[PDB]
Design a protein around this ligand. Structure first.
Ligand SMILES: Cc1cc2nc3c(=O)[nH]c(=O)nc-3n(C[C@H](O)[C@H](O)[C@H](O)COP(=O)(O)OP(=O)(O)OC[C@H]3O[C@@H](n4cnc5c(N)ncnc54)[C@H](O)[C@@H]3O)c2cc1C
Length: 489
């Protein structure tokens, strides 16, 4: 008989470097590009920024398939229920999709494989979300994931280069068959943020999709010397007009950009610049942080929680809803913190060291609230929200796993001031402070009342007083952390 295939998108929201897609197309009479959208997903905490970035990414996919004589089908429902019916309707002989190592993904994918088997459908699941087959890495390491980035980097180097990106798909693709009721255009289109039921528009400045991802890739590679010399810890968290890092994270999260393409492009530059930066600080090192946390996270039970998580220190975090709320709502009274939390909710992206500042403040630095609570807030609002990376970094920042130097505490006043003494970042995200003299903008409570009134920003009415004294709070937290480390024996 003829081959009729499904290419199922979940991540990997791209045509480039898509071995799943290339297989689906091979010798196929009809190809059905599918994304399965849960129409009740938002009736359960998800930002319109995040969801709309997905929608824009699916719109871009739709355009790309339409340009090649095909069409993206956005099926409504649950995969386990939808696939059995479309398998029979479409006479499907092959289902292809990119492997996903998240916990829910593994449960869902096992069930779809069983269903496919019952229908006589071959399943093909190439690895292309991560640089490497992460189970292969664990296996080559003797059965456990490396637990430091140094040892992880050594492991990947023994394995060698990640696979090259797969070729671009053909200029024409086999379409869905005609008169297939589950492929009706009216039931299978990409909805708008209004239609999924949001009442407030997205404010983020970064647009979804593969086209934008590739454009932003080319922008970053415009200066190869910048790419070659890139050192992460030396980049500026206060830069917002021209962010100091690539802002490729949302594109990498959704697979609008291939990590292997990015990595291959880095090696090309590196060959022409043999003095380039090395891991962990290099741009390649950044993709390795991602790979490291995917590898550990995918092989650790309860990785996104404290209890029952074998890598995580059990810490006596306070049940402090008022402190969490003040942090989440950008009303701590420390303009650096509040400006970053404002960027979180308005853009859904902040620089890495901005995330460091706010996460340290929430957890082991000032407020002693669980990292699980911070992760949850980040999960709601980040356009790059990534299960493994979010958990791992919150555990790092809280000195719960990977990192143990709890005497290193960032200052919510001093940290940003060393980059941006003018307070340009604060003024942008906290316009109530836009006329405050630079001298006081990180510590507005120290402005004379005449200065506050003249600025139109009186502390305690226009902008909150600080919710803690940093010196007192950090001292208290450091003592609690020391005690928590002693109890774990
Ligand atoms: C508390 C906290 C929570 C975080 N949550 C997320 C999240 O949900 N999703 C997410 O993608 N990143 C997260 N990060 C990591 C990092 O801050 C972002 O990946 C980075 O800010 C993205 O900006 P960029 O694309 O310009 O990074 P670049 O510096 O240009 O790096 C290129 C890519 O490497 C990866 N990367 C870079 N830094 C890290 C890192 N420290 N850990 C893992 N991968 C990295 C990303 O895919 C990134 O796009 C978190 C960090 C902290 C401290």
């Amino acid at each position: 008989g003829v081959k009729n295939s499904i290419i199922w998108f979940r991540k990997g929201l791209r045509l480039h470097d898509n071995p799943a897609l290339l297989e689906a197309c091979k010798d196929a009479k009809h190809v059905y590009p599918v994304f399965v959208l849960d129409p009740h997903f938002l009736q359960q905490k998800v930002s319109v920024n995040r969801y709309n970035f997905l929608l824009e990414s699916l719109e871009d996919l739709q355009r790309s398939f339409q340009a090649r004589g095909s069409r993206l089908l956005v099926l409504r429902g649950k995969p386990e229920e939808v696939f059995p019916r479309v398998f029979r309707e479409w006479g499907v002989t092959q289902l292809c999709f990119e492997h996903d190592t998240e916990p829910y993904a593994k449960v869902r994918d096992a069930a779809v494989r069983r269903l496919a088997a019952e229908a006589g459908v071959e399943v093909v699941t190439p690895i292309s979300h991560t640089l490497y087959d992460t189970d292969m890495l664990v296996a080559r390491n003797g059965g456990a994931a490396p637990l430091t980035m140094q040892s992880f980097t050594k492991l990947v180097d023994r394995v060698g280069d990640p696979p090259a990106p797969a070729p671009d798909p053909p200029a024409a693709m086999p379409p869905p068959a005609e008169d297939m009721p589950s492929a009706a255009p009216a039931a299978t289109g990409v909805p708008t943020w209004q239609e999924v039921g949001f009442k407030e528009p997205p404010l983020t400045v970064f647009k979804g999709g593969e086209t934008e991802a590739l454009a932003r890739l080319e922008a970053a590679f415009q200066d190869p010397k910048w790419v070659a010399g890139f050192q992460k810890p030396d980049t500026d968290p206060s830069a917002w007009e021209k962010p100091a890092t690539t802002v490729l994270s949302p594109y990498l999260k959704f697979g609008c950009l291939s990590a292997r393409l990015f990595h291959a492009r880095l090696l090309e530059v590196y060959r022409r610049h043999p003095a380039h930066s090395q891991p962990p600080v290099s741009l390649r090192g950044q993709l390795l942080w991602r790979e490291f946390f995917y590898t550990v996270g995918s092989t650790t039970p309860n990785f996104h929680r404290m209890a029952g998580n074998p890598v995580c220190k059990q810490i006596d975090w306070d049940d402090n809803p008022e402190f969490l709320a003040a942090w989440r709502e950008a009303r701590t009274g420390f303009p650096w913190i509040d400006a970053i939390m404002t960027q979180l909710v308005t853009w859904g992206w902040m620089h890495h060291l901005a995330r460091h500042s706010v996460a340290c403040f929430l957890t082991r630095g000032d407020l002693y609230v669980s990292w699980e609570r911070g992760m949850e807030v980040f999960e709601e609002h980040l356009i790059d929200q990534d299960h493994y990376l979010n958990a791992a970094n919150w555990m790092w920042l809280s000195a719960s796993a990977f990192f143990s130097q709890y005497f290193r505490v960032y200052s919510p006043v001093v940290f940003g001031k060393k980059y941006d003494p003018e307070g340009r970042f604060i003024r942008k995200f906290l316009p109530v402070l836009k006329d405050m003299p630079a001298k006081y903008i990180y510590e507005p409570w120290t402005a004379p009342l005449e200065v506050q009134r003249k600025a139109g920003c009186v502390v305690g009415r226009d902008y909150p007083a600080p919710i803690v004294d940093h010196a007192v709070a950090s001292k208290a937290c450091i003592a609690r952390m020391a005690a928590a480390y002693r109890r774990s024996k």
